[PDB]
Design a protein around this ligand. Structure first.
Ligand SMILES: CCCCCCCC/C=C\CCCCCCCC(=O)O[C@H](COC(=O)CCCCCCCCCCCCCCC)COP(=O)(O)O
Ligand SMILES: CCCCCCCC/C=C\CCCCCCCC(=O)O[C@H](COC(=O)CCCCCCCCCCCCCCC)COP(=O)(O)O
Ligand SMILES: CCCCCCCC/C=C\CCCCCCCC(=O)O[C@H](COC(=O)CCCCCCCCCCCCCCC)COP(=O)(O)O
Ligand SMILES: CCCCCCCC/C=C\CCCCCCCC(=O)O[C@H](COC(=O)CCCCCCCCCCCCCCC)COP(=O)(O)O
Ligand SMILES: CCCCCCCC/C=C\CCCCCCCC(=O)O[C@H](COC(=O)CCCCCCCCCCCCCCC)COP(=O)(O)O
Ligand SMILES: CCCCCCCC/C=C\CCCCCCCC(=O)O[C@H](COC(=O)CCCCCCCCCCCCCCC)COP(=O)(O)O
Ligand SMILES: CCCCCCCC/C=C\CCCCCCCC(=O)O[C@H](COC(=O)CCCCCCCCCCCCCCC)COP(=O)(O)O
Ligand SMILES: CCCCCCCC/C=C\CCCCCCCC(=O)O[C@H](COC(=O)CCCCCCCCCCCCCCC)COP(=O)(O)O
Ligand SMILES: Nc1ncnc2c1ncn2[C@@H]1O[C@@H]2COP(=O)(O)O[C@H]2[C@H]1O
Ligand SMILES: Nc1ncnc2c1ncn2[C@@H]1O[C@@H]2COP(=O)(O)O[C@H]2[C@H]1O
Ligand SMILES: Nc1ncnc2c1ncn2[C@@H]1O[C@@H]2COP(=O)(O)O[C@H]2[C@H]1O
Ligand SMILES: Nc1ncnc2c1ncn2[C@@H]1O[C@@H]2COP(=O)(O)O[C@H]2[C@H]1O
Lengths: 392, 392, 392, 392
C-alpha cells in the first residue's frame, strides 16, 4: 500500500508543473522563489521511473523525466525556444494511465473518464488563459486582474457562451481565438457525450423490467386475457422487482462455475434437505445431487400448489413463503408451514393420489424436485434405491 | 392514502423555503409579513420526521428540521454568517427521494429524472439570480426590475446563449460569473444527456422488428430467394407487427412462473380443448398437460396446413383464423372452419393417410399438438390410453 | 390510394393556417385578400373529419374544425381575445399522427421524428418571430425588414448562438425573451438527442461483427493460439462479413414460422436433394424431412472435409463453393465438384472406411446431413428403410 | 497496392479544387498562376473514371469529370452563372465512399465517420467564409485580413459561440447568416451525436462484467449468502477479468465453424490428451472426439476437485493451474501437478472409490471429461472399448 502514496505524490508534482510552467512562461519573475520546489520535483520525476520499474507507451516517462526546464528559465531563451518546458506535461498521460488502473474497480469507468476529462479541461483552460495573456499588448495592470480576465475569456469561449465583451484585436489574437474556439467546441462535445453515456446506463435493470412487463401486457392484450389474470401477473412482476430487481434465479446461477454454484446451492438448501426422513443417513454426494437439481418456482398468494385427489409427482421445499394445508373441501386447516419445512414427501416413493390441498398465503418462492430427476439420479446410488423400494 | 397529502404539503413547504430564503437574503425587509408562514412551515418540518419514522441517508432531514433561520433574520447577522439559512434547502434531497419512489411505477423513470432536473434547474436559476442581485452596486431601482434583470442574465448564461448586454463589471462579479458559466455548461450537458437517453429508448420494439426484417431480407438476398417468397415473408412480418408488435408467443410466456403460465394457457385453450370427442370425460390433469403442450404456429393466406394423401401426425386447434377444407383435387369445399373448432383429430389414434386438404383463408394463428408429445404424456394416464387403443 | 391526396391537401391547409394566422395577427390588413382561401380551407377542415371517420385523441379535430377565426378578424377583437384563432393550429397533432402511420414502414422512425421536429421548430420559429414583432415599439419600417429582423433574432436565440445585437428593451420583451430562451434550449436539446439516437443505431451489424472478432481474438490470445490459426479465423470472419454481413444461417431461420422455413429450405435445397440416387423415387414428405434437417457448415480454403481412411458418418451437399477429390496420398485429382453436386453418399447405407480425400478450393458453404438424423427419420418411413437395407 | 497511390492523388486533387474554387470565385485574379495545376487536375479527373472501372451512385463521377470550370473563369461569367464551377466538388462523395471501404476494417467506423465529418466541416467553413467575403461591401483591405475575418466569423457562428463583434449589416447578409446559423446548429449537433456514439461503445466488456458482478452480488444478497462465499465469488470474477476479460470459453467457441473449432481444440489439448496411458496407440478420430468433448471448468484456490472416498465419474486435464494431491486426512502430499498432466484417469475404466484428495493451489482453469460422454462415444469405436474392458 506504499505505492499509493507515491502515486499521489506524483500526481501532486505533475499538477504543480501544470500550474507553474505556463504561469512562469507568462511571468519570468516566478523562477527564483519556487526554485527549491522545482529542484525537488525534478528529483522526484527522475527517481519515479526507477520506482515505476520496481513493483510494476513509455516515451512520456522518459520525456518528462529529463529537465528540459531549469535551462530555458536560466539562460532566458527567446519565445520560440522557451516552449520546450511543456514537454514535462506529458506526465499527465502516465498519471491518468495509473489512475485508470488503480481505480478501475471501485469507481464506474464512465464516471472516472468524465472526472479525468473535467480535470484535463480545467488544466487546459489555465494553459489557454496563460497563452492568451502572453499574446496581449503590454500594459501596466496587476497580474491577478490580467489572469482573471484571461481566465474569464477562456471560460466564456470554452463553454460556447460567447458574451463578446473580450474579443480579438490583432491577427495573431484572431488565429489563436479560432484555434481555441475549435478546441472548445470539441471539448464541450466530449463532455456532452460523456454525460449522455453516463446517463444512458444508469437504470438498466428497471428499464429491462419495464420492457418485459410492457411486452407481456401487450401480448396478453392481444390474446384477450381477463383483467384478473393480468392483475395477478402485474402483482407478481411487482413483487419480483421489490425482491430481486426482476432477476430469475436460473439465469443468475449460470454465471458461476460448478464449485461456486455447488457452494451457493449447499448454503441455500442444506439444512432443509438434510432434515428429510427419506434421505437421512444417506451420503453427501447423493445430497449434493439433490441440492443441485432443485428448481426454483414462485407461487402467488391464493395459488394452488398441490390439489387434493391429483396423482402428483413432485416434492416442494419451502424457502421464503408460508403455506396452508387444507382439506379436499377446504373446510379444515391441517397445518401452517413456514421456512425450513417441506410437503409432498410421500410422492418420491409412491405414485398414489395426494392426501391434502396446499395453498399459498403470500408469495412463496419455494423449490421443487420432480420424480423424474430423482429416479434418474437414483440409478447411480442403488443402496438408497433399495431403501426407497422397501419403503414403498 | 393519507401520506400523499403530507408529501404534497412537504413539497409545497420546501418550495416555499426555496423561493423565500434567497429572496429575503437579498431583501431583508420581507421577514415580518411572512413570519406566520415561516413559523408554520418550521413546525411542519419539525413534525415531518416523526411522521417519516411512522408508516415508513438521514442527515438531510435533521439538518433541515432545526431552524437555522429565524435567527439570522432576527439578530441581523452579517453576510458570511447569514448564508446558514440555506441548510434548510437540503429537504429537496428527501422530497426528490420520496417522489422517485412514490411514482417509480406510474411514470417512466427517465421522464421523472428529466422533470426533477428541470425543477432543480429552475430553483437554482432563482437562487443564482438572487446571488447576482446581491453582489451588484447599490442603486435606486424597483425590486421587480432588478429581479427581472438578474433572472434574464442567469437564464442567458445557463442556456449558453450569451447575448452579452449584461456582463461582469467587478472582479467578484467576474469570479461569480465564471462559476455560474461552469455550472450552466454542466446543467445544459445534463439536460441534453437526459433528453438523448429518453429518446433512445422510445421505439424499441419497432426498431427490433425493423432490424429482424432487414437481417432476414439480406440473408434471403444472399441465398437468391425468389421475390414471391420474400413478398410472403414481408407480409407475414407486417401482420406480426400489426397484431402482436413483432413478438413470438413462446418467448413471452417463458417470462411467467408455472402457475401463471398454466392459468394463461387454460384461459386461452380451455373450451377448445374440452370440446373434443377423444378427450371428453377425461380428467382435469390430462387436460392440463395437453393445454400445456400446444405449440403456436401462424399459417399465411393460401398456405397448406394438411395435404391430402400424406401420412400425418399432428392435430390443429383454430384460435384466430379461418380455414377451408377441400378435396384432393381441390374442386369441392367440404366445410369452412372458424374459431373454437379443430381439424385433424383422426391422427392421434391412427397413423392413416389423411382424408382431405386444409387451406388457410387469411392468417390463421392456430395451435398444434404432435403425436409424439401426446404419446409421451399418455404413458402416465393409462386409462385414457386404453380408451384410445380401443378407439383405434 | 385516394386518401393520400386528401392527407397532402390537409397538410397544405394546416401549413397555410400555421403561416397566415400569426402573420395576420401581427398585420390585420392581410384578411380581405386571402379571404377566399380562408373560406375554402375552413370548408376543407369542416369536411375532413367526416372523411376521417369514413375509411379509417379526437378533441384536436373538433377544436380545429370549428372556425374560431373569421370572427376575431371580422369584429376586430382586442389582443387578449384575438389569440383564439390559434386553436386551429391543433390540426398539426393530427397531421403528424397521420404522417407517422402512413410512413412508419418506408422511413426509419427516428428520421421521421427528426424531420417532424425540424418542421415543428421552423413553424414555431415563425410564430415566435411574429410574437416578437407584435411586442415591439411602433415604428415606420417596411414589413419585410421587420420580419427579417424578428426571424433573425429568433433564429439567433433558438440556436443558442446569441450575437447580442438585438436584445430586449422593455420588461415585457425581457419576459418574452426568457421564455423563448428556455424553449430554445429545450428544442436544441431535443434536436441533439434525436441526432445522437439516429447515429447510435446506424452501423449495428458492423459493430456486432467487430465485437465478436475482438472477443474471439482476445480469447485466442489468452489460450496462446498460433498466428496461423488466428489468421485463418480472421480470414473466415472477413469472408462472413463480405458475404452475409456476419450472420449465422441457423439464427436467421429461427425468425420464421414452420411453413415459411419449409418453403425457404425447399427453394434452397430442392434440386440438389432430389437428384440423389439413394432417394430418387421416394415420396415428398421424406424429401421434406431431409430438406428440414440439413445443417449449414462453412469450410475454409485448404480445409479437410473428408479424410481418406476415416470411418465417416456424414453426407455433404455443395451449395456455393468448389471441392477437389484427391487420393490418400493426395497425388491424383479424381474430380472437381461444383454447385448442385454432392459427395459422401456411400455413408448413409454403410459405415465403411471412406474412399477418398475431400479438400476445399475456396470457402465452401455446404450443407451436411449426419447418419443419426437420417436413421432417426428413417424409422417412420419403413419402405425407404427397406430399400436402403437391401442396398447395403 | 498501386490503387492506394491513385486514391491518395485523387483525394489531393479534390482537396485542391475544394480550396481553390471558392477562393478564385472570390478573387478572380488567381486563375492564370494556377492554370497548369488546374489543367493537370482536370486531366486526372477525366482519366480517373476509366481507372475506376478497371480493377473495381455514379452520377457524381460524371458530373465532376467534365470541366464546368475553365470557362466561367475564362469567359468571365456573371455571378448567377459563375457558381457552376462547384459541381466539381461532388467528387468528395466518391472520395469519402472510397475511403469508407479502403479503411472499414483497420479503423473503427465511428471514428472514421467523425474524422470525415470534421474534414467536411472544415471544408464547408472555408466555403462559407468565401461566401461571406463575397457578399461584403467593397473596401481596400489586404486579402489575408479579409479572409481571416470571414473565417473568424464563420468559426464563431458554426461553434454556436457567437461573440457578436462581426454581425450582419444588409438584408442579404442577414439571410445568409440565418442560413449559416441553421447549418452550424445542424453540424454541431451532428458532431455531438458522433462523439456520444463513439464514447458509448468504448468500454463494453468492462460494463458487461460490472453488470454481471452487480446482478450476482444483489441476488446473493437476497438469498443471505455468507460474506466468505461472496468474497470467493468476487475474487473469481476479478480473476476472470484479469485473465480473459470476463469471457466464458463455451460462448466464444460457438462463434466458430466446426473445422476451426476442431483446429483450436486440437492446438489446445493435443499433447495433453495424446500422452495418456489409456488412449495411447488409438486412432486420430477417437482422439478428435475426446478433444471435442472436453469441458472447461475453473477451480478457485483451496477448492476441492476430487475428495477421498467419493465414487467419482470424471477425469481432469490440467491446462493452466497447479494442484496438490493429498491424503484422506490431508497430512501427506503425494505430489504436485502442473501444466500438461492429468489426474483421475482410473475412473473411465472402473467406477471404484477414489484413491486421494485433489486440491487447488491457485486458480486452475482445467478441462474435464465425464464418463457418460466417454461411454457414449466409445460405442462407435469398439476396438478401444474392448481394450478398456480388458483393462477393467
Ligand atoms: C503548445 C502551445 C501553443 C502556444 C501558442 C500560444 C502562445 C504563443 C507564444 C508567444 O509567442 O507569446 C509571446 C511571448 O512568448 C512568451 O515568452 C510567453 C509564452 C507563454 C506560453 C504559455 C504556455 C501555453 C500553454 C499551452 C496552450 C494550450 C508574445 O508575448
Ligand atoms: C471554479 C474556478 C474559479 C476560478 C478563478 C481564477 C481566479 C484567480 C484570480 C485572482 C486575482 C484576485 C482578484 O483580482 O479579485 C479579487 C476578488 O476576490 C475577493 O473578493 C478577495 C477576497 C480581489 O478583488
Ligand atoms: C451557497 C452559496 C454561494 C453564495 C455566493 C453568492 C452571493 C455571496 C454573498 C454576498 O457576499 O453578498 C453580499 C451581501 O450579502 C447578503 O446579505 C445577501 C446574500 C444573498 C445570497 C443569495 C442566496 C444564494 C443562493 C445559492 C446560489 C446558488 C453583497 O452585498
Ligand atoms: C418561465 C419563467 C418566466 C419568468 C420570470 C420572472 C418574472 C418576475 C419579474 C416581475 C416584475 C414585473 C415587471 O417589472 O414587468 C412587468 C411586465 O409584465 C406586465 O406586462 C404586467 C401585466 C411590469 O411591466
Ligand atoms: C400562445 C401564445 C403566446 C403569445 C404571447 C406573445 C405575444 C403577446 C400578444 C400581445 O400582447 O401583442 C400586443 C398586440 O397584440 C396583437 O394584436 C398581435 C399579437 C400577435 C401574436 C402572434 C401569434 C403568436 C404565435 C405563438 C407564439 C409561440 C402588442 O402589440
Ligand atoms: C432557411 C430560412 C431562411 C429564411 C428567411 C425569411 C426571409 C423573409 C424576409 C423577406 C423580406 C425581403 C428583404 O427585405 O430582403 C431582401 C433581400 O433579398 C434579395 O436579395 C432580393 C432578391 C430585399 O433586399
Ligand atoms: C452553393 C452556394 C451558395 C452561394 C451563396 C453565397 C454567395 C452568393 C454569390 C454572390 O452573389 O456574391 C456576389 C459576387 O459573386 C461572385 O462572383 C463571388 C461568389 C463567391 C461564392 C463562393 C462559393 C461558395 C461556397 C459554398 C458555400 C457553402 C456578391 O459580390
Ligand atoms: C485551425 C485553423 C486555423 C486557421 C486559419 C486561417 C488563417 C489564414 C489567414 C492568413 C493571413 C495572415 C495574417 O493576416 O495574419 C498573420 C499573423 O500570423 C503571423 O504571426 C505571421 C507569422 C500576419 O500578421
Ligand atoms: N396432517 C398434516 N400435516 C402437515 N402436512 C400434511 C398433513 N397431511 C398431509 N400433509 C401434506 O400434504 C400433502 C398432500 O399430499 P402429498 O402426497 O403431496 O403429501 C402430503 C403432505 O406433504
Ligand atoms: N366433412 C368434413 N367436414 C369437416 N372436416 C373434415 C371433413 N372431412 C375431413 N375433415 C378434416 O380434414 C382432415 C384431413 O385428414 P385428417 O386425418 O387430418 O382429419 C380430417 C378432418 O379433421
Ligand atoms: N471417382 C470419383 N469421383 C467423384 N467423387 C468420388 C470418386 N470417388 C470417391 N468419391 C467421393 O469421395 C468420397 C470419399 O468417401 P465416401 O465414402 O465419403 O464417398 C466418396 C464419394 O462421395
Ligand atoms: N501417488 C500419486 N501420484 C500422483 N497422483 C496420484 C497418486 N495417487 C493418486 N493420484 C491421483 O489421485 C486420484 C484420486 O483418485 P482417482 O481414482 O481420481 O485417481 C487418482 C489419481 O489421478
Amino acid at each position: 500500500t506504499y505505492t499509493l502514496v507515491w502515486k499521489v505524490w506524483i500526481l501532486a508534482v505533475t499538477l504543480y508543473y501544470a500550474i507553474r510552467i505556463p504561469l512562469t512562461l507568462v511571468f519570468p519573475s516566478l523562477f527564483s522563489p519556487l526554485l527549491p520546489l522545482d529542484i525537488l520535483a525534478s528529483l522526484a520525476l527522475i527517481a519515479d521511473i526507477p520506482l515505476d520499474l520496481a513493483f510494476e507507451s513509455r516515451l512520456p516517462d522518459l520525456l518528462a523525466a529529463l529537465p528540459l526546464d531549469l535551462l530555458v528559465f536560466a539562460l532566458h531563451l527567446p519565445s520560440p525556444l522557451s516552449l520546450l518546458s511543456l514537454v514535462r506535461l506529458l506526465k499527465l498521460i502516465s498519471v491518468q494511465r495509473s489512475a485508470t488502473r488503480i481505480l478501475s474497480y471501485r469507481i464506474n469507468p464512465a464516471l472516472l473518464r468524465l472526472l479525468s476529462l473535467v480535470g484535463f479541461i480545467l488544466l487546459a483552460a489555465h494553459g489557454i488563459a496563460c497563452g492568451w495573456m502572453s499574446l496581449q499588448p503590454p500594459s501596466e495592470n496587476p497580474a491577478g486582474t490580467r489572469y482573471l480576465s484571461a481566465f474569464y475569456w477562456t471560460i466564456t469561449t470554452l463553454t460556447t457562451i460567447g458574451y463578446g465583451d473580450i474579443t480579438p484585436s490583432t491577427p495573431t489574437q484572431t488565429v489563436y481565438t479560432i484555434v481555441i474556439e475549435l478546441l472548445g467546441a470539441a471539448m464541450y462535445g466530449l463532455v456532452i457525450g460523456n454525460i449522455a453515456s453516463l446517463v444512458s446506463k444508469l437504470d438498466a435493470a428497471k428499464l429491462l423490467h419495464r420492457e418485459r412487463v410492457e411486452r407481456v401486457t401487450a401480448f396478453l392484450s392481444y390474446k384477450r386475457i381477463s383483467p384478473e389474470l393480468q392483475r395477478r401477473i402485474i402483482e407478481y412482476f411487482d413483487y419480483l422487482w421489490e425482491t430481486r430487481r426482476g432477476y430469475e434465479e436460473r439465469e443468475v446461477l449460470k454465471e458461476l462455475p460448478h464449485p461456486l454454484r455447488l457452494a451457493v446451492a449447499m448454503e441455500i438448501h442444506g439444512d432443509v434437505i438434510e432434515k428429510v426422513p427419506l434421505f437421512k443417513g444417506a451420503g453427501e454426494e447423493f445430497i449434493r445431487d439433490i441440492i443441485l437439481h432443485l428448481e426454483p418456482v414462485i407461487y402467488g398468494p391464493g395459488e394452488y400448489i398441490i390439489r387434493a385427489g391429483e396423482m402428483g409427482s413432485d416434492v416442494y421445499f419451502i424457502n421464503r413463503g408460508s403455506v396452508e394445508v387444507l382439506s379436499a373441501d377446504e373446510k379444515t386447516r391441517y397445518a401452517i408451514l413456514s421456512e425450513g419445512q417441506f410437503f409432498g414427501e410421500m410422492a418420491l416413493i409412491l405414485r398414489a393420489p395426494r392426501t391434502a390441498t396446499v395453498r399459498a398465503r403470500a408469495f412463496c418462492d419455494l423449490y421443487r424436485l420432480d420424480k423424474e430427476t430423482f429416479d434418474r439420479i437414483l440409478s447411480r446410488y442403488p443402496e438408497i434405491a433399495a431403501q426407497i423400494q422397501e419403503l414403498a
